Amino acid sequence: LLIPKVWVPPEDPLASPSRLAKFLRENGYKVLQPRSLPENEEYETDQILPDLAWMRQIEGAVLKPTLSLPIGDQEYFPKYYPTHRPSKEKPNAYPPDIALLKQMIYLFLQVPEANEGLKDEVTLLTQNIRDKAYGSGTYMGQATRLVAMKEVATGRNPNKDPLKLGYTFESIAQLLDITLPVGPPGEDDKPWVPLTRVPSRMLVLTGDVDGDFEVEDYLPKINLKSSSGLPYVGRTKGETIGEMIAISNQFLRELSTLLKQGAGTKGSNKKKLLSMLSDYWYLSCGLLFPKAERYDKSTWLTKTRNIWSAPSPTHLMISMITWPVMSNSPNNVLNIEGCPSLYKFNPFRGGLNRIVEWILAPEEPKALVYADNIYIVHSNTWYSIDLEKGEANCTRQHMQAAMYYILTRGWSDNGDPMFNQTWATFAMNIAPALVVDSSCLIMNLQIKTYGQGSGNAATFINNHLLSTLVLDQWNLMRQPRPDSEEFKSIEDKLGINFKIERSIDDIRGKLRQLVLLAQPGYLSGGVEPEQSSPTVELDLLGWSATYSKDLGIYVPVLDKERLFCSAAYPKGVGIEQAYKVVRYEALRLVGGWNYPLLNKACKNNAGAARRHLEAKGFPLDEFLAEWSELSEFGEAFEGFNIKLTVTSESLAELNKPVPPKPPNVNRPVNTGGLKAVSNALKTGRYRNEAGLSGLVLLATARSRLQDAVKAKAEAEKLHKSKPDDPDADWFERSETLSDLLEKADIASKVAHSALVETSDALEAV
């Protein structure tokens, strides 16, 4: 067929609890004993959050006059039933862009003579339209995916505790000092508030509502349109802002109280604390949300990606630790010598050109890193590497090391903790157990989660941590070539699975050739293309490279396959026409501009829309005001404040080099790169760059869940012990502190750390 007929998705074989459980059970996938939680009861908002009563008596008061709290007398087992689209019954959910296809075939037929290079565009669009389908897959797909994750975390190459492999909290932190340099929160004459308050206290007021206006919001960024999570299935975070704040407050207040319990009390304080955690088990159970993607039709029943939708309170709590720090750490390879991070990289404004120049540089082997993505240049070959199902490789202690790193580097003033023991206990011994190796909810089944829940506030940091460790092992092996057995052996050493998704030989040569063979187009002569200009499909965070004669630099082009995959299946008065303009112009702007047929087709299809909206008086201009929020590609143009239009001028404006943002860090990163630090740390002799803060957190992690306050004290003492150079040797202060902890008998037993106690409590039935 020239134009494929509508596709009817096969029937979902696991669309019922009985079938799903059977499948999981026969694949050795752990199903937990179900837990129940209190029904939600109505409550006066000003009664629960009296300190925020002011927010409701104003315009833009997201706080409802009442709150639904999980504190009712009767309990219930929660259920989550995701709607999958399209489906055998309603297969018309997300239609292929057949109009675009017809237009392209028409343009090709219009071209006198013939050109196989132009035909390839329709051939590729066609292939995508029949091989793929955009949607949320099926239960069978989510489930099959899950046993794959368990397989990554278990079996072939079982996950490993980095701490039992020779790494230490500080050891991993000095690798991240380079790999993911971080700065303090705020970054102003008037910084950020310390981690010592309950979330509602992050909202401060000045203007008495009678004066004028003045509110200080220190709460993290939150997607109001995303799911609220376990406590409130069927609701958005935006509809549960109050309850999200109230539950976090209550949870943090009880934790504090339980940590300040007096000794010599009727009953064990241990059980009281563990019971409180059990009552909050739902904070460790994410909704198994089916991620809408353009999947392969042949894979509809065997592969659907899942999003571990974290419960609002857990997400808010963890974000109060990570976001303030991370959002102020635009530190990467473009603004810090020796830094392999691509953290807040953007290919536009000269971004891509710098990466290419970094590749061209003769130095090698070298590496770039971004979460679970690793890019290595070795023997003049470019290797795009992916951790295999990254998240499933994560261990509770990996995240613990991540929280340590973030607190010691982001919440510490010259070694001085900027957090109380409540937060230290949460960050080091609660949060890791809540979102890693905890559980999830699908249908009415409470199921195990292997590895970290893809979606928890720290999934990026945790994945970046994992890649960082393989880079460390790579360095210690003298940087073998990625295709070697030596490189692969890193898998067994860290228990982390990975694979090469792409390889490009003679990369410097091919990159230089882009200059020589650039074809005329919007960025080379300022004309409508007739032939696509060559590129190098780096897939650098989704981007390819091509040369611009007009700007004299390399500019980005969206990876060919991704561009045509999106073109084949668009995502979710005359609003329909307005969106088509966004769809078509965005496709061009992001890379379509470099492909003759696609470009002209989107250009024409978009043109018609503008005209139709014109002969309707539609205020298109006011509509596209913040178009970045209406496009699947908007994330790339957010902080650019540009007009949605594709011309040689606009594209030139978009790629015109701009100076890199200044880095924000404490101690100047080892300019010698990761392998300098890798070789150093291997010695076993390194300083405690975390200072007192590091000792406090190490003490908190090695002590009983209940002895957080004492754990800190033993740390403060030990720090004063060596007055001249206390942070001289980490392994020293470590072995010492362990003795002190055991002397005070607050040191947890070998196989029963605070983390394990918490994980068992959350599961306890």
DSSP, residue by residue, 598-621: HHHHHHHHHHHHHHHHHTTT--HH
Q: Tell me: is residue 668 an annotated ligand-binding position.
A: no
Contacts of 509 (CB under 8 A, 6+ apart): 380
Q: CA distances (Å), 684 to each of 66, 171, 373, 492, in order?
A: 56, 9, 28, 22
Neighbours of 646 (CB within 10 A): 22
Neighbours of 4 (CB within 10 A): 12
For domain 85-137, give the fold.
Answer: Helix Hairpins (1.10.287)
Whether the domain at 16-84+138-330+388-455+753-765 and the domain at 85-137 fall into the same CATH topology: no
Q: Give yes or no for a contact between 244 and 228, defined as CB atoms under 8 angstroms apart.
A: yes
Q: Tell me: is residue 704 an annotated ligand-binding position.
A: no
Resolution, rounded to a tenth of an Å? 2.5
Q: Tell me: is residue 231 an annotated ligand-binding position.
A: yes
The domain 669-752 having CATH identifier 1.10.1740.80: the answer here is: yes
Q: Tell me: is residue 495 an annotated ligand-binding position.
A: no
CA–CA dist 435, 311 (Å, integer): 10
CA–CA dist 443, 452 (Å, integer): 20
Return the structure tokens found at 259.
């940590």
Residues in the chain: 765
Phi and psi of 687, rounded to 5°? -80, 165
Neighbours of 346 (CB within 10 A): 22
**Is the torsion defined by CA of 632, 635, 641, 647 positive or negative?**
negative
CA–CA dist 563, 149 (Å, integer): 28
Q: Say which CATH class 16-84+138-330+388-455+753-765 falls into.
A: alpha beta
Neighbours of 159 (CB within 10 A): 24
Long-range CB contacts (within 8 A, 24+) of 635-644:
636/346, 636/347, 636/348, 636/590, 637/348, 637/589, 640/348, 640/349, 644/581, 644/582, 644/585, 644/586, 644/589
Sheet holding 543-547, edge to edge: 536-540, 543-547, 554-558
How many CA atoms within 13 Å lie on the side-chain side of 531? 11
Residue 598, amino acid: L
CA–CA dist 679, 662 (Å, integer): 28
Return the structure tokens found at 607.
């043109």
Q: Give yes or no for a contact between 284 and 434, defined as CB atoms under 8 angstroms apart.
A: yes
Q: What is the DSSP letter of 254?
A: H
Q: Give yes or no for a contact between 559 and 594, defined as CB atoms under 8 angstroms apart.
A: no
Return the structure tokens found at 198.
């309950």
Q: Is 750 helix (H, G, I), strand (E, B) or coil?
A: coil
CA–CA dist 693, 695 (Å, integer): 5
How many CA atoms within 13 Å lie on the side-chain side of 211? 7
Q: CA distances (Å), 64 to each of 48, 86, 241, in order?
A: 12, 35, 9
CA–CA dist 549, 288 (Å, integer): 48
CA–CA dist 143, 513 (Å, integer): 46
Residue 635, amino acid: E
Does a cis peptide bond (omega within 30 degrees of 0) precede residue 596?
A: no
CA–CA dist 437, 285 (Å, integer): 10
Q: CA distances (Å), 330 to each of 218, 318, 326, 463, 465, in order?
A: 19, 20, 8, 18, 17
The DSSP bridge pattern shows strands 381-387 and 132-135 to be unpaired
Return the structure tokens found at 310.
């974290």
**Rg of the chain over all Cα atoms, to the nearest angstrom:** 27
CA–CA dist 703, 306 (Å, integer): 35
CA–CA dist 670, 338 (Å, integer): 7
Q: Give yes or no for a contact between 537 and 522, defined as CB atoms under 8 angstroms apart.
A: no
Q: Is 55 helix (H, G, I), strand (E, B) or coil?
A: helix
Contacts of 262 (CB under 8 A, 6+ apart): none
Q: Give yes or no for a contact between 128 and 567, defined as CB atoms under 8 angstroms apart.
A: yes
The DSSP bridge pattern shows strands 132-135 and 203-205 to be unpaired
CA–CA dist 48, 545 (Å, integer): 55
Does a cis peptide bond (omega within 30 degrees of 0) precede residue 365?
A: yes
Phi and psi of 498, rounded to 5°? -160, 170
CA–CA dist 116, 690 (Å, integer): 61
Return the structure tokens found at 707.
């002895």
**E strand spans, 310-456:** 366-370, 373-378, 381-387, 412-413, 416-417, 439-442, 445-448
**Cα angle for residues 752, 756, 759 (degrees, 5° grid):** 155
Method for this entry: X-ray
Q: Give yes or no for a contact between 456 and 283, defined as CB atoms under 8 angstroms apart.
A: no
Q: Tell me: is residue 525 an annotated ligand-binding position.
A: no
Q: What is the DSSP letter of 9?
A: P
Please state the three-class secondary structure of 43-79 as a single string: EEHHHHCHHHHHHHCCCCCCCCCEEEECCCCCEECCC
Q: Give yes or no for a contact between 135 and 292, defined as CB atoms under 8 angstroms apart.
A: yes
CA–CA dist 412, 758 (Å, integer): 26
Q: Give yes or no for a contact between 422 and 255, defined as CB atoms under 8 angstroms apart.
A: yes
Q: Give yes or no for a contact between 385 and 374, defined as CB atoms under 8 angstroms apart.
A: yes
Neighbours of 217 (CB within 10 A): 8
Q: Tell me: is residue 234 an annotated ligand-binding position.
A: yes
Q: Exposed, middle or buried: residue 477 (CB in 10 Å: 0-12, 13-18, 19+)?
A: middle
Q: Give yes or no for a contact between 577 and 623, defined as CB atoms under 8 angstroms apart.
A: no
CA dihedral in degrees (325, 180, 405, 394; nearest 10)?
110
For domain 560-658, give the fold.
Answer: Helix Hairpins (6.10.140)
Token pair 């290595």 in the structure block, residue: 376
CA–CA dist 736, 525 (Å, integer): 69
- Domain range list for the chain: 16-84+138-330+388-455+753-765, 85-137, 331-387+456-559, 560-658, 669-752
**Nearest in space to 736 (alpha carbons), one of 689, 708, 695:** 695
Contacts of 120 (CB under 8 A, 6+ apart): none
Q: Give yes or no for a contact between 19 and 11, defined as CB atoms under 8 angstroms apart.
A: no
Helix axis angle for 575-590 and 648-655, nearest 10°, is 60
CA–CA dist 635, 543 (Å, integer): 14
